[PDB]
Each structure stands twice: as structure tokens, then as C-alpha cells.
Design a protein around this motif. Structure first.
Motif, PDB file in Angstrom:
ATOM      1  N   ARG A  73       0.980  -1.342   0.090  1.00 55.34           N
ATOM      2  CA  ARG A  73      -0.021   0.022  -0.050  1.00 55.34           C
ATOM      3  C   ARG A  73       1.022   1.297   0.097  1.00 55.34           C
ATOM      4  O   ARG A  73       0.474   2.223  -0.456  1.00 55.34           O
ATOM      5  CB  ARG A  73      -0.979  -0.074   1.316  1.00 55.34           C
ATOM      6  CG  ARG A  73      -2.223  -1.323   0.960  1.00 55.34           C
ATOM      7  CD  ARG A  73      -3.179  -1.256   2.077  1.00 55.34           C
ATOM      8  NE  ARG A  73      -3.808   0.085   2.455  1.00 55.34           N
ATOM      9  CZ  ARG A  73      -3.402   0.587   3.385  1.00 55.34           C
ATOM     10  NH1 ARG A  73      -2.679   0.271   4.336  1.00 55.34           N
ATOM     11  NH2 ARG A  73      -4.118   1.986   3.830  1.00 55.34           N
ATOM     12  N   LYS A  74       1.887   1.316   0.511  1.00 53.06           N
ATOM     13  CA  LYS A  74       2.915   2.479   0.523  1.00 53.06           C
ATOM     14  C   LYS A  74       3.589   2.650  -0.783  1.00 53.06           C
ATOM     15  O   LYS A  74       3.620   3.750  -1.095  1.00 53.06           O
ATOM     16  CB  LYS A  74       4.062   2.057   1.609  1.00 53.06           C
ATOM     17  CG  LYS A  74       4.589   3.541   2.268  1.00 53.06           C
ATOM     18  CD  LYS A  74       3.819   4.076   3.087  1.00 53.06           C
ATOM     19  CE  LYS A  74       4.209   5.477   3.497  1.00 53.06           C
ATOM     20  NZ  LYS A  74       5.629   5.666   3.988  1.00 53.06           N
ATOM     21  N   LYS A  76       2.120   1.695  -3.721  1.00 52.64           N
ATOM     22  CA  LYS A  76       0.994   2.516  -4.513  1.00 52.64           C
ATOM     23  C   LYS A  76       0.677   3.782  -4.048  1.00 52.64           C
ATOM     24  O   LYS A  76       0.642   4.677  -5.150  1.00 52.64           O
ATOM     25  CB  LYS A  76      -0.312   1.643  -4.458  1.00 52.64           C
ATOM     26  CG  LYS A  76      -0.234   0.168  -4.965  1.00 52.64           C
ATOM     27  CD  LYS A  76      -1.607  -0.421  -4.378  1.00 52.64           C
ATOM     28  CE  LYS A  76      -1.562  -1.856  -5.344  1.00 52.64           C
ATOM     29  NZ  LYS A  76      -1.651  -1.833  -6.542  1.00 52.64           N
ATOM     30  N   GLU A  77       1.076   4.100  -2.822  1.00 50.09           N
ATOM     31  CA  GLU A  77       0.818   5.514  -2.428  1.00 50.09           C
ATOM     32  C   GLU A  77       1.850   6.380  -3.030  1.00 50.09           C
ATOM     33  O   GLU A  77       1.557   7.412  -3.706  1.00 50.09           O
ATOM     34  CB  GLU A  77       0.995   5.549  -0.904  1.00 50.09           C
ATOM     35  CG  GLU A  77       0.258   6.812  -0.279  1.00 50.09           C
ATOM     36  CD  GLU A  77       1.264   7.949  -0.274  1.00 50.09           C
ATOM     37  OE1 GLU A  77       2.428   7.665  -0.454  1.00 50.09           O
ATOM     38  OE2 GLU A  77       0.796   9.184  -0.488  1.00 50.09           O
ATOM     39  N   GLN A  78       3.252   5.948  -3.084  1.00 45.41           N
ATOM     40  CA  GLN A  78       4.249   6.686  -3.165  1.00 45.41           C
ATOM     41  C   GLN A  78       4.208   6.782  -5.105  1.00 45.41           C
ATOM     42  O   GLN A  78       4.535   7.793  -5.458  1.00 45.41           O
ATOM     43  CB  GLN A  78       5.504   6.000  -2.981  1.00 45.41           C
ATOM     44  CG  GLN A  78       5.739   6.159  -1.584  1.00 45.41           C
ATOM     45  CD  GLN A  78       7.193   5.525  -1.007  1.00 45.41           C
ATOM     46  OE1 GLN A  78       7.743   4.858  -1.784  1.00 45.41           O
ATOM     47  NE2 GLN A  78       7.560   6.081  -0.073  1.00 45.41           N
ATOM     48  N   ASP A  79       3.544   5.762  -5.758  1.00 39.23           N
ATOM     49  CA  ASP A  79       3.454   5.967  -7.132  1.00 39.23           C
ATOM     50  C   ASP A  79       2.474   7.276  -7.401  1.00 39.23           C
ATOM     51  O   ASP A  79       2.525   8.172  -8.064  1.00 39.23           O
ATOM     52  CB  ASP A  79       2.768   4.671  -7.810  1.00 39.23           C
ATOM     53  CG  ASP A  79       2.162   4.937  -9.056  1.00 39.23           C
ATOM     54  OD1 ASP A  79       3.063   5.524  -9.956  1.00 39.23           O
ATOM     55  OD2 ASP A  79       1.067   4.373  -9.523  1.00 39.23           O
ATOM     56  N   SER A  80       1.537   7.147  -6.625  1.00 37.08           N
ATOM     57  CA  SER A  80       0.438   8.572  -6.722  1.00 37.08           C
ATOM     58  C   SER A  80       1.015   9.919  -6.504  1.00 37.08           C
ATOM     59  O   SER A  80       1.050  10.772  -7.248  1.00 37.08           O
ATOM     60  CB  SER A  80      -0.737   8.393  -5.994  1.00 37.08           C
ATOM     61  OG  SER A  80      -1.503   7.039  -6.346  1.00 37.08           O
ATOM     62  N   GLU A  81       1.908   9.791  -5.306  1.00 37.58           N
ATOM     63  CA  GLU A  81       2.610  11.099  -4.917  1.00 37.58           C
ATOM     64  C   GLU A  81       3.578  11.480  -6.281  1.00 37.58           C
ATOM     65  O   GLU A  81       3.477  12.643  -6.386  1.00 37.58           O
ATOM     66  CB  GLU A  81       3.302  10.799  -3.897  1.00 37.58           C
ATOM     67  CG  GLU A  81       2.562  10.603  -2.445  1.00 37.58           C
ATOM     68  CD  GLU A  81       3.629  10.366  -1.174  1.00 37.58           C
ATOM     69  OE1 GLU A  81       4.494   9.682  -1.344  1.00 37.58           O
ATOM     70  OE2 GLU A  81       3.015  10.410  -0.048  1.00 37.58           O
ATOM     71  N   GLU A  82       4.277  10.215  -6.627  1.00 37.82           N
ATOM     72  CA  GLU A  82       5.281  10.951  -7.739  1.00 37.82           C
ATOM     73  C   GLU A  82       4.634  11.440  -8.813  1.00 37.82           C
ATOM     74  O   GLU A  82       5.059  12.579  -9.413  1.00 37.82           O
ATOM     75  CB  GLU A  82       6.072   9.662  -8.176  1.00 37.82           C
ATOM     76  CG  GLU A  82       7.372   9.957  -9.114  1.00 37.82           C
ATOM     77  CD  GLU A  82       8.222  10.956  -8.477  1.00 37.82           C
ATOM     78  OE1 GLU A  82       8.523  11.253  -7.439  1.00 37.82           O
ATOM     79  OE2 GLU A  82       8.478  11.764  -9.440  1.00 37.82           O
ATOM     80  N   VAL A 145      -7.002  16.210  -5.873  1.00 38.06           N
ATOM     81  CA  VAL A 145      -7.641  14.963  -5.178  1.00 38.06           C
ATOM     82  C   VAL A 145      -8.835  15.329  -4.752  1.00 38.06           C
ATOM     83  O   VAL A 145      -9.777  14.262  -4.384  1.00 38.06           O
ATOM     84  CB  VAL A 145      -6.608  14.488  -4.209  1.00 38.06           C
ATOM     85  CG1 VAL A 145      -5.169  14.089  -4.726  1.00 38.06           C
ATOM     86  CG2 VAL A 145      -6.679  15.176  -2.885  1.00 38.06           C
TER      87      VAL A 145
END
Ligand SMILES: [Ca+2]
Ligand SMILES: [Ca+2]
Ligand SMILES: [Ca+2]
Ligand SMILES: [Ca+2]
Ligand SMILES: [Ca+2]
Length: 146
Positions: A73-74, A76-82, A145
Motif C-alpha cells: 500500500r505504501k 502504490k501511495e508513493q506511485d500516486s505521490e510521484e 484529489v
């Protein structure tokens, strides 16, 4: 379908750097040892919050399955952040951490939308929280978002 053997290997290697005594669990203490290596010296209370957020069976330690889950989950989160970061950098033409009216208008033109100052000003007013007439990263994310 979920993970390759190589992914699970890299997940295990990471877990091992936390599980100092190889017992199959990460404790608050072991998490502390790692963080202290990284320049942070959290309190037992801080460490317990960090464990409680991810120890699913409320048993007090994090196991490898629990780690896989929080890691996936972290990531996938970091993918979105990037993606958000890379977009903010398309708009912040000069890199001063703020999207100005002129910058936004320039990028919008290239994105195919030839906007007026009034139109771009309204866009900025919609997102601007600190009132500075610019869109900083937090304001950008909050709008993108929500
Ligand atoms: Ca351990
Ligand atoms: Ca602290
Ligand atoms: Ca657990
Ligand atoms: Ca700028
Ligand atoms: Ca602002």
C-alpha cells in the motif's frame, strides 16, 4: 496473481533489516533500533503508534505478511505521490515552489487551452489557501484529489 518470487525476496530482505533477531516479528524496540540508525530517536509511545498502525492481529508485533500488506500500500501511495510531484513540476516553470498566474497560463496554452488572465486568476483563487495568489504543492494536491 499477486507477487513474483523476486518481489517476495526483496520484501523479505527489507523485513530482515528490521527483524534484528530473525524471530519473524518486528517489535517496537527493533523498529527503534533501525530509526535510531537513521537519525531519529522516537519515544516508546511514538514507536507503539507506528506498530499499532500496521500490526493487524493486534498481537503487538509486525509479521512478514503484515509487512507485505503495508508495503504494497505504501508503494502504490508513493506511485500516486510521484505523479502529482511530476505534474506540479510541469506547472512550476521556474522551480520556486509556487505556480504563478503566468506559469499556469503558459502551461495551459501548451496543454491546448488558451486562457485569459481573468480565467487563470479564478482557477488560482479556487485552489489558493494562503492567499498569496500562487499555487504551492499542498494547494495543488488538495485541489487535484478534491
Ligand atoms: Ca524480531
Ligand atoms: Ca519524538
Ligand atoms: Ca501482528
Ligand atoms: Ca514558480
Ligand atoms: Ca497559495
Amino acid at each position: 496473481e499477486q507477487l513474483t518470487e523476486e518481489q517476495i525476496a526483496e520484501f523479505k530482505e527489507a523485513f530482515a533489516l528490521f527483524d534484528k533477531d530473525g524471530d519473524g516479528t518486528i517489535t517496537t524496540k527493533e523498529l527503534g533500533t533501525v530509526m535510531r540508525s537513521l537519525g531519529q530517536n522516537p519515544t516508546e509511545a511514538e514507536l507503539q503508534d507506528m506498530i499499532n498502525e500496521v500490526d493487524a492481529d493486534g498481537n503487538g508485533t509486525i509479521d512478514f505478511p503484515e509487512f507485505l500488506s503495508l508495503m504494497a500500500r505504501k508503494m502504490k501511495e508513493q506511485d500516486s505521490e510521484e505523479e502529482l510531484i511530476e505534474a506540479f513540476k510541469v506547472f512550476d516553470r521556474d522551480g520556486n515552489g509556487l505556480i504563478s498566474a503566468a506559469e499556469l497560463r503558459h502551461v495551459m496554452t501548451n496543454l491546448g487551452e488558451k486562457l485569459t488572465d481573468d480565467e487563470v486568476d479564478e482557477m488560482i483563487r479556487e485552489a489558493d489557501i494562503d492567499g498569496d495568489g500562487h499555487i504551492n504543492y499542498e494547494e495543488f494536491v488538495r485541489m487535484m484529489v478534491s
